[PDB]
Swiss-Prot record:
The modification N6-methyllysine is found at K533. The modification Phosphoserine is found at S5, S58, S65, S418, S488. Ca(2+) 1 binds at E6, E243, D248, E251. It comes from Equus caballus (Horse). Binds water, Ca(2+), Na(+), K(+), fatty acids, hormones, bilirubin and drugs. Its main function is the regulation of the colloidal osmotic pressure of blood. Major zinc transporter in plasma, typically binds about 80% of all plasma zinc. Major calcium and magnesium transporter in plasma, binds approximately 45% of circulating calcium and magnesium in plasma. Potentially has more than two calcium-binding sites and might additionally bind calcium in a non-specific manner. GO terms for cellular component: cytoplasm; extracellular space; protein-containing complex. InterPro entries: ALB/AFP/VDB (IPR000264), Serum_albumin-like (IPR020858), Serum_albumin/AFP/Afamin (IPR021177), Serum_albumin_CS (IPR020857), Serum_albumin_N (IPR014760). This is Albumin. Keywords: Allergen, Calcium, Cleavage on pair of basic residues, Copper, Disulfide bond, Lipid-binding, Metal-binding, Methylation, Phosphoprotein, Repeat, Secreted, Signal, Zinc.
Length: 583
């Protein structure tokens, strides 16, 4: 898309403010390591370039591609080789090779110093210089989540800004700030995961698979819209994320804005839940539509049996126009089931497909495919009871022991996985119990299982980066719709050799006493996973007891007149005797 110069075009479409915002995000995700100012200089430089081009588009070099321009700007940076390692190789390559080299080296979980609210100093710096401050924010969130949805990051920057504004000045204290900043980081964390699943999908299953997922999700959201309105939106939205994921965020943001416009101007054909979204400033608008409540079910939903199970011309339809015919099933089944997870709907469309394949090659296909809806029952029953089992446990035991139950379940299934990772998924999925399990019954299953899909994908990108098990690699290669079943089936290698015991690994010391409550928990959950790695046959209940004993002992020695002497004289007794109590 152009005027003549793509850079002018996007400068014009987006405005300086959003243009500069997006350019920073792009430079940060591509160059995660570079200092802040070194990015401010390249953003400024490039922005000036665009400005100059908007004034005279036939100016020399204004007609270059965005890659050529942006990769050039990156490739001037910081005597790279000594700092940016391989990135420097990328700089030897022409387009599209270079861009492709750059994208290939994006780094997912890179260790940098994790996000930390510091109220007085941050506030000073905020009123001192908001654009530096907000920009620092983007740079920081972007370089830590190289696949974060660019235009949503601008959105959350505004939320970050509203926080500091109403909080620095009304100062009877700044626990005005910790609630909000804590709540933001989580919405940050979840949105990054939502998007990484989108970019993961493109990378591993291509665009069809992303389409299916959308058709299923958007049909749930906009069930009053016809198959045609849903495909259009889907086509438009796939192109938006395909862009964002391939790092073209300017084109991405511009096409997104066009989609927001298209949906606000056609609400009547799409959903009755858009009025208050469609009255908002652009960034609030888009975000509002991305998180829209599902619409009420229309009164004229077709009955499905007649079309998909009783029509005697199904095999022909399925031969003559397979994709249309499958898409229509997915659109219909989905709009009907806002209470199913997306992966569940994909698995059902796939069983529907596989049944027609078998049945149409037989002597009497309709006798065969007439019970196809009966194939779905088991499939629905499985997650439902999985969610019931987990919510029940969570309600009975609370968040911390639920997290613990999960950490045991996982470490037994994959003891080769690092302890901080085993503890982090357990903690995350425990939190999902907290959020999903208190919902009305019919929204529990998607909240749970949708959130669990984001966690599994995280697990599988992390795994590809640092792999430890073929069995996980295999779960991570299956379709999105089989991923969860494969993870549920994954189980402790009968031949797995217990991890040799290491006394130091279970020895606690006094430091623990002053740590924040969550850090105290991580340290305990860490030891939990280690206990399981060393005693992989130990009972949940034995683990709960030994771990109940490690907490008692920690509490006691932390309230001790001599904290160290307490730890040193009682720690070893309990380390030895705990081994004896694990089967």
């Amino acid at each position: 898309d152009t005027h003549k110069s793509e850079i002018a075009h996007r400068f014009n479409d987006l405005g300086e403010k959003h243009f500069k915002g997006l350019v920073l995000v792009a430079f940060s995700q591509y160059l995660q390591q570079c200092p802040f100012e070194d990015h401010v200089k390249l953003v400024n430089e490039v922005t000036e370039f665009a400005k100059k081009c908007a004034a005279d588009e036939s100016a020399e070099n204004c007609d270059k591609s965005l890659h050529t321009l942006f990769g050039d700007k990156l490739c001037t940076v910081a005597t790279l080789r000594a700092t940016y390692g391989e990135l420097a190789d990328c700089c030897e390559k022409q387009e599209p090779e270079r861009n492709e080299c750059f994208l290939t080296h994006k780094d997912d979980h890179p260790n940098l110093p994790k996000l930390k609210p510091e109220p007085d100093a941050q506030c000073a710096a905020f009123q001192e210089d908001p654009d530096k401050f907000l920009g620092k924010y983007l740079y920081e969130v972007a370089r830590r989540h190289p696949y974060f949805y660019g235009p949503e990051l601008l959105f959350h920057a505004e939320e970050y800004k509203a926080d500091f504004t109403e909080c620095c000045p009304a100062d009877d204290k700044l626990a005005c700030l910790i609630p909000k900043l804590d709540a933001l980081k989580e919405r940050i964390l979840l949105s990054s995961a939502k998007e990484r699943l989108k970019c993961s999908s493109f990378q591993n299953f291509g665009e069809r698979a992303v389409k299916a997922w959308s058709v299923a999700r958007l049909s749930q959201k906009f069930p009053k819209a016809d198959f045609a309105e849903v495909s259009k939106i889907v086509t438009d939205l796939t192109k938006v994320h395909k862009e964002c994921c391939h790092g073209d965020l300017l084109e991405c943001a511009d096409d997104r804005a066009d989609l927001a416009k298209y949906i606000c101007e056609h609400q009547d054909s799409i959903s009755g839940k858009l009025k208050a979204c469609c009255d908002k400033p652009l960034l609030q608008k888009s975000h509002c539509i991305a998180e829209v409540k599902e619409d009420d079910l229309p009164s004229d939903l077709p009955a499905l049996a007649a079309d998909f199970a009783e029509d005697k011309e199904i095999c022909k339809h399925y031969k003559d126009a397979k994709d249309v015919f499958l898409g229509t099933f997915l659109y219909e089944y989905s709009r009907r089931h806002p209470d199913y997870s997306v992966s569940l709907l994909l698995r059902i469309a796939k069983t529907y497909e596989a049944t027609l394949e078998k049945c149409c090659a037989e002597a009497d296909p309709p006798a065969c495919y007439r019970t196809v809806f009966d194939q779905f029952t088991p499939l629905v029953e499985e997650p439902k009871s999985l969610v019931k089992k987990n919510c029940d446990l969570f309600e009975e035991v609370g968040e911390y022991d639920f997290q613990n139950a999960l950490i045991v379940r996982y470490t037994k299934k994959a003891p080769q996985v690092s302890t901080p990772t085993l503890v982090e998924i357990g903690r995350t999925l425990g939190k999902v119990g907290s959020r999903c399990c208190k919902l009305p019954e019919s929204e529990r299953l998607p909240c749970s299982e949708n959130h669990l899909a984001l966690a599994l994908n995280r697990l599988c990108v992390l795994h590809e980066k640092t792999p430890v098990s073929e069995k996980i690699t295999k779960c991570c290669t299956d379709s999105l719709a089989e991923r969860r079943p494969c993870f549920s089936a994954l189980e402790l290698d009968e031949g797995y050799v217990p991890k040799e015991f290491k006394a130091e690994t279970f020895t606690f010391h006094a430091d623990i006493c002053t740590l924040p409550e969550d850090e105290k928990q991580i340290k305990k959950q860490s030891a939990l996973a280690e206990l399981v790695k060393h005693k992989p046959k130990a009972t949940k209940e034995q683990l709960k007891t030994v771990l109940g004993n490690f907490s008692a002992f920690v509490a006691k020695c932390c309230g001790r007149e001599d904290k160290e002497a307490c730890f040193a004289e009682e720690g070893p007794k309990l380390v030895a005797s705990s081994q004896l109590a694990l089967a």
